[PDB]
């Protein structure tokens, strides 16, 4: 609904400052995290973040760590709510791909150079991420140089590929509509003389379907296209409506010729499940 | 504050003429520098502009390739060179600087070029 | 390319009467329409920078009136030295001028 | 050892500098050449009549007190030098709650050219107000403005101006469209002067023209309404002997239309006039009620 | 140039902890406003949002200079170095100033010590709506402000003739209501600390029928 | 304990104590109960919660902290802080599940060679819980369980102090909201068999309404839990009840 | 649902600092609220609050007023979201007892 995603990371940077070079003590100094306000640290910013913060308990969660040759390591514990624009035309059978662009603000590419440290073991801890709905399929690390009207700045990109699990939706929204259609099919085994029973069936079914649809759309944003679940619900509603209008057609010509009415009821009993199974199969083969 | 253009030119058809516009009273790095042509008894027409701080020059689509606009920051001058000229562009060429609300407040004086044999 | 249709083509009017000139832009030009006064054998002089803003040294008898597309230049008590061309030029995009109106005395 | 010479240059720049005085305080009007780069047009909140926009707000004035002469031409300094010099106090006339990003360091920039020409860009997230006239809902089009001017500096002191041709100043990134409901058509800039009780201020305006996408409203209101009307008119082809069937048809269709009106009015702000969708739902209600009345008469 | 010298001479021997005329007489403060927009009046929380340009002007005989320039026009860089009254709004649930891009403040020090201090505010004021006659109800609910620590003997506020001036009243977010008028008022309240001069601005809102007419009736 | 975010809030008095020989003093008093601003001028360990989401350090009215410098250099540094930690839950036994919500905390930037942590009292008697200190509406705290370990990050080898809180959900609410309506619906659906066979509209209404109710109930009950991709126990109960109801409808159809 | 209540109060404390005692002037000094960062103020905290903040418009809403005998008077304008667990076994015919605890 917000087209975003929140990730917490241990963001570490390592450069080489020749001015912070010492050759008296042989140990890798680890200073308090407050000396980082007196060194130079690169002006790194995430381009597609919306709300982020360095965790500040019990202190500002950052690490500064010199080395006797000038190398500086500088880690933070960040929680970025990055922007994830999603294409929901296959929802809930969709595979999303939204990134994390890491760019330097002030310094052009002739003043700083970004590169992943290790270039494949730079980003760790991805195979331990357990999401309740999605499932990380792949992740990639990219290195570019974007161009704005003020220069050409370096950029790194960390990109995931989340494939949505379909168990919850099969549990919540497909089965109720399927069983409502099965219930609607019962209206054919009732004798065509019953005017309330059959009508009760068809009308309760119609209302149920439409209400389910409306409620299901409340959990998503105002997306202007037809998702996959919307297509399934529209097909189920068409099947229900057709069942009701076939009872109505039977009731129209009942007094005139009951033989045709019984024939139509038999044909419906035979050919509503067939057409519904055919539509269901073509659906689950077009999207899966 | 005071823009001094070049003198009149009498050029044969098929040659290149380079008109100069010396700005005295300000630095050309601050503003743009527009070149305008005006044939006798007709409306003004835009040729192109140049940003002397960078060198970004834009031209009118019907003047692209025929004219080129360069600068010289040391002498505060703008040069307009007509690459290939026929016998039809016998107009008056003005040099102007952009004003407050993107108007052209200070104009030059006009170098009336003449193409003949 | 934004084109400025300036009207009328050439008008003749006597001394001391109010006169108005119109400049209709094709596309949108917010208030970036300037009015220049070019006397014969001289370089154009900026009268109205932006819509309805007189330039330093312009008499108060010149007034601009701006809109999104239609613009107006009204002269009040017209003197005897106001016999010149009056060009309107937008600047919202790359500058394109109008055809100009030859003001005359009669 | 360029560090020492550049430190000396910086200390000469700030030696005898007063950041409470605008450049050219006595004999000049400061000219701030602004520019905007819209990295992403945020989601237009229809309930709050607001809209979010993430920008690269660029400004550039001429300070003669920051002239230097060294090996480099442009000093690409840190964002912490920008607090020791004078910087214009541009505020957004209609912004509600704007944030300046501080991840991981202050997202700012400062380039001091050798002739004094400064350049100062920020990365902002402006939540501006977009008053909407929802009289054609959901077939409406809006023009969301973005007015920014100076605070405490009248027109005789600080004048703003676009840095390129006004048509090419406000740029929108190609992939920068977080709009899921609307459709951005184009920008339109303008510059004016507002009077006040304190003075005359220069105000730069930028309208982003929008156009709502009707697909979702179609799917969730117009299709259910039309289907209900059809289901209601079905009650005419049933025979006159089956009274309970037609009564159920009528009553359930009227209830469905009522709940549809309720669910359709929830999406919009609590507005005190009637939209187009309201007229459509009223006419469909009238049709179903007329079907029921006809059945009752029969 | 010489304005730096003036600003340096004004802040030499200046204590921004002592109000002007600390032991002589109360400080008279003239308050003006400019209501940009009166935000949505949500009845559920009994609150309403308003956006104003609060202006306070007083006399400070210590910021008194003698030069050719008549007025010193300054941004928010010198607001934290002079004395500034601690005006707070007594019925604001949550309110905050604006900080983008630079703190939205203005300071103008005239020649005779007269100081003008202007800032931009967005106040979520509180007013207990008597929800009878709903939705045919009319309210008139206030915005009250006063000094915090200085009682009536030290800080006295006073409206100007043309103090409160609404804007266009058309681009406001008053959906269910309709602005009909306003009025300013000054009173004195008693607190455990002392007697305070409380100023108020009453805005009159009338609920326009419509949404409820088509939603329930 | 929020079930949707798989998180839980806690409010602690985090006490730490080390020995700084640079703070030895001899004077009239033994301990110096100093302000909380003196603690910003000495060295204080940079403890952070490895699985915290958004923790706050209360500073109402002043910063809520405490610093006591004993005369022999021993420091005591106490904070009051609310930690919103993570607690991954396995909801296959919902709503009859039991969790162990951890609270791991260690140092930032100081490996095991530099800063090592320990419990001040016996590890069993360190993490104390107040008597009236329980805001658990739905769960029921059984007991704590502390432990010390050594984790390895990309920067070094750190010491991690873990604390588990054993929680046990209360089934009272879910009974009355899901299991009672499902059972009542099943009974209502089975009532249809005792009606006469010459009353088709009545039994048809019974069947269709029971199915509609079961559908609405299956939709509502799922709304509480996070969108997990497996079937809980309450879901199995709802599925079996839906089976029974639909079977009764099909038995009426056959009759 | 959150088992808490929100209250806005004018919290005020009064102690006697014998170091801030004067006798040359007879009036009660009311200093700017920025001097409260240079004096000693007690470390009072509310035990059962969840989110609190001193109002800060147009300035930090606090008062710091000295007396000639040393008495210091320190007031704040706080908005505390105190947490009070409610016993809903007799909802809605129930009486809640919500408290606010103030401790050093
Ligand atoms: C519990 O803990 C809480 C967290 O620690 C704590 O909250 C913190 O309170 C303190 C004090 O109350 C806050 O600090 C003050 O904040 C004031 C403004 O706060 C607004 O802005 C901050 C963000 O601040 C950035 O933006 C402003 C505006 O641009 C800058 O001025 C800041 O320097 C800072 O800029 C940096 O960060 C930017 C990114 O955001 C970068 O872009 C930038 O480049 C810088 O890197 C917001 O966070 C605030 O929101 C919070 O507060 C509001 C209050 O209503 C709440 O409603 C809200 O919910 C949030 O909680 C808020 O929006 C600063 O003005 C102030 O600094 C001035 O005052 C001090 C003290 O007087 C001076 O020492 C200082 O120098 C500043 O004065 C100079 O500037 C003013 C400008 O007005 C001048 O008038 C003045 O004369 C002076 O100028 C002179 O000196 C200058 C150098 O200093 C020089 O340049 C000039 O030329 C001249 O010589 C101070 O920083 C802090 O923000 C709060 N933090 C949070 C998270 O809330 C809370 O109080 C604690 N509770 C208790 C009970 O203790
Ligand atoms: C009975 C099915 C219920 C009705 C189906 C409607 C339908 O098909 O919708 C058409 C169109 C709607 O318009 P939109 O493009 O969504 O409007 C927004 C747009 N202007 C923008 O914003 O860009 O969408 C499409 O055609 C694209 C999707 C076609 C997928 C076909 C899947 C078949 C699977 C199988 C199902 C059909 C099998 C039939 C077997 C009997
Ligand atoms: C549950 C209820 C029923 C479900 C099953 C019924 C099957 C219906 C199939 C319709 C498919 C849905 C359409 C999806 C796409 C969609 O809504 O496109 C919109 C079309 O709106 C337009 O083109 C605007 C006007 C047309 C919309 C509605 C017109 C209906 C009138 C029909 C009268 C028939 C009744 C007379 C007895 C605009 O989408 P976009 O703006 O994003 O982009 C496209 C720009 N058009
Ligand atoms: C371009 C279309 C836009 C129109 C907007 C709304 C229109 C509503 C839908 C159409 C209304 C009626 C449709 C045409 C009339 C039916 C034709 C046959 C009926 C007929 O013969 O007329 C009498 C009325 O029956 C009836 O048909 C009775 C029902 C008719 C009106 C009932 C009043 C319902 C009020 C609806 C509003 C309520 C809520 C709205 C928010 C029947 O009997 P007779 O004996 O008089 O015939 C005299 C001959 N024998
Ligand atoms: C569609 C209609 C819906 C509308 C209204 C429907 C319901 C209204 C009917 C009114 C009368 C119903 C009688 C209910 C009595 C009180 C219910 C309270 C249940 C409750 O909270 O008890 C839990 C017991 O947990 C447990 O251990 C209980 C779980 C076991 C339940 C067994 C279910 C019975 C299955 C057999 C039925 C046979 C069917 C016929 C073949 C408490 O739990 P706590 O955690 O607070 O701790 C405390 C002890 N544990
Ligand atoms: C849960 C299921 C448990 C329900 C208990 C079933 C016991 C019924 C047996 C007692 C009656 C004797 C019997 O077999 O007669 C049949 C009764 O049909 C029936 O009892 C109808 C069978 C029910 C159909 C099953 C519907 C599937 C439900 C799944 C949909 C929803 C799933 C949930 C997600 C008629 O049969 P006959 O023609 O052989 O007559 C000759 C048989 N003496
Ligand atoms: C935005 O980010 C910047 C940089 O990350 C933050 O700047 C830092 O602000 C703190 C607090 O104002 C500074 O600490 C202070 O240092 C002075 C000494 O100059 C000391 O007297 C104070 O008591 C305090 O400890 C810190 O130096 C400063 N760092 C830099 C590089 O300028 C800024 O606070 C952030 N703003 C927000 C709203 O998060
Ligand atoms: C998720 O989406 C992102 C964004 O589209 C994907 O990043 C794209 O990855 C491909 C393959 O790594 C890049 O193509 C490369 O282009 C360079 C250009 O020189 C070429 O040298 C390489 O051989 C390769 O062809 C592509 O540039 C990159 N997108 C952008 C905007 O840079 C990513 O692959 C997707 N998948 C995952 C798992 O994240
Ligand atoms: C705002 O306050 C001022 C000052 O109290 C009011 O001005 C007074 O108005 C009354 C009647 O209109 C006059 O009799 C007084 O002479 C005015 N006093 C001054 C000092 O000018 C003004 O009416 C108030 N605005 C309202 C109530 O809307
Ligand atoms: C079953 C339904 C239609 C839908 C509503 O049922 S409910 O369970 O959803 O409220 C109202 C309702 C009540 C009475 C039912 C009716 C359907 C048609 C019935 C069976 C007749 O011919 C005589 C009695 C009628
Ligand atoms: C400092 O770090 C480097 C790289 O991690 C390592 O090789 C070296 O041994 C370290 N120094 C000491 C004294 O441990
Ligand atoms: C100072 O405050 C005390 C407290 O009530 C009061 O008795 C005394 O009169 C005050 N001083 C003056 C000068 O009013």
Residue numbers in the entry:
A (entry chain C): 53 to 340
B (entry chain K): 2 to 118
C (entry chain L): 1 to 106
D (entry chain D): 10 to 307
E (entry chain E): 25 to 241
F (entry chain B): 53 to 307
G (entry chain A): 53 to 156
Passage from the reporting paper:
γ-Aminobutyric acid type A (GABAA) receptors mediate fast inhibitory signaling in the brain and are targets of numerous drugs and endogenous neurosteroids. GABAA receptors belong to the Cys-loop superfamily of pentameric ligand-gated ion channels. GABAA receptors mainly assemble as heteromers, and each subunit shares a common topology, with a large N-terminal extracellular domain (ECD), followed by four transmembrane α-helices (M1-M4; TMD). Binding of GABA to a resting-state receptor results in conformational changes that allow anions, mainly chloride, to pass through the intrinsic TMD channel and, in most cases, inhibit neuronal excitability.
We sought to resolve this controversy by determining structures of the α1β2γ2 GABAA receptor in complex with GABA + PS and GABA + DHEAS at 2.6 Å and 2.7 Å resolution respectively. DHEAS and PS share similar chemical structures and differ only in the C17 carbon substituent of the sterol D ring: the carbonyl oxygen of DHEAS is substituted with an acetyl group in PS. These sausage-shaped densities follow the central axis of the pore from the −2′ position to the 9′ position, and exhibit features suggestive of the sulfate group orienting up, extracellularly. MD simulations showed that the former orientation, with the sulfate up, is relatively stable, in contrast with a tendency for the neurosteroid to move toward the intracellular side when the sulfate is oriented down. The most consistent contacts were with the 2′ residues in α (V257) and β (A252), where mutations have been shown to reduce NAM activity. Indeed, the pore poses for both PS and DHEAS were destabilized in simulations with serine introduced at either αV257 or βA252. Interestingly, whereas DHEAS interactions were primarily with these residues in the inner pore, PS contacts were distributed more broadly among positions −2′, 2′, 5′, 6′, and 9′, and sampled greater deviations from the initial pose.
